[PDB]
Design a protein around this ligand. Structure first.
Ligand SMILES: [Ca+2]
Length: 240
């Protein structure tokens, strides 16, 4: 997250870190949202590589013992069947991970609340992106979980020519674009939390930014629109 502030430890308890085994250690690669005690919602593109993955819940600082973490292997990966790795702009950047064990809920570990199916946010709705991704374009991952206030940019504006044009689909949510604050590599798969009727819900799964850089004016961060996938999500969890 570029232009973020450090999140309080208990603000976003559905945020997870998706990590892959790298030698004798584990490397953060993406965010995710805990949606059942044994299912995480993330981005399809985060799990294209043939890696060994684990999820960490109750995580705050990737580089130090927080006293709150639970580490769990990934037992099954269900990518949206329409996803195509060579075409992020087509959409469908969403995947569910069934965890090998059910995690224990507490102040640091809670299920993310999802929007009702089809819900579209009005332009300029208040949302926060969270994650441990790069804190600058071509920078380094965050140690501590970061948040950045990224108001939505509606489909009409976002798909206009000076924004993302044809690249953005109505199955996506755009947010930010101010040239200062944005997601960045390593935030993919994580939540966009938006305040609606007094309650935060996870409206986006972080998907992409500009090839030109993370924080680029009129290139808001782009997210898979969670509310486009409620039936798909329910179908997967019920069949698995
Ligand atoms: Ca930690």
């Amino acid at each position: 997250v570029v232009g973020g502030t450090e999140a309080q430890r208990n603000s976003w308890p559905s945020q997870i870190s998706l990590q892959y085994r790298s030698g004798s250690s584990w490397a953060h690669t993406c965010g995710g949202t805990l949606i059942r005690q044994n299912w995480v919602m993330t981005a399809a593109h985060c799990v294209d590589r043939e890696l060994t993955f684990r999820v960490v819940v109750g995580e705050h600082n990737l580089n130090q013992n927080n006293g709150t973490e639970q580490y769990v292997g990934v037992q099954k990966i269900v990518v949206h069947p329409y996803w195509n790795t060579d075409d992020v702009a087509a959409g469908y950047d969403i995947a569910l991970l069934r965890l090998a064990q059910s995690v224990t809920l507490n102040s640091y570990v809670q299920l993310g609340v999802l929007p009702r199916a089809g819900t579209i946010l009005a332009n300029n709705s208040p949302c926060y992106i969270t994650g441990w991704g790069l804190t600058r374009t071509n920078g380094q991952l965050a140690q501590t979980l970061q948040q950045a206030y990224l108001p939505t940019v509606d489909y009409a504006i976002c798909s206009s020519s000076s924004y993302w044009g044809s690249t953005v689909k109505n199955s996506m949510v755009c947010a930010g674009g101010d040239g200062v604050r944005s997601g960045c590599q390593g935030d993919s798969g994580g939540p966009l939390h938006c305040l609606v009727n007094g309650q935060y819900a996870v409206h986006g799964v972080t998907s992409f930014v500009s090839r030109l850089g993370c924080n680029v004016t009129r290139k808001p961060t782009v997210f898979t629109r969670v509310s486009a996938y409620i039936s798909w999500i329910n179908n997967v969890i019920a069949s698995n």
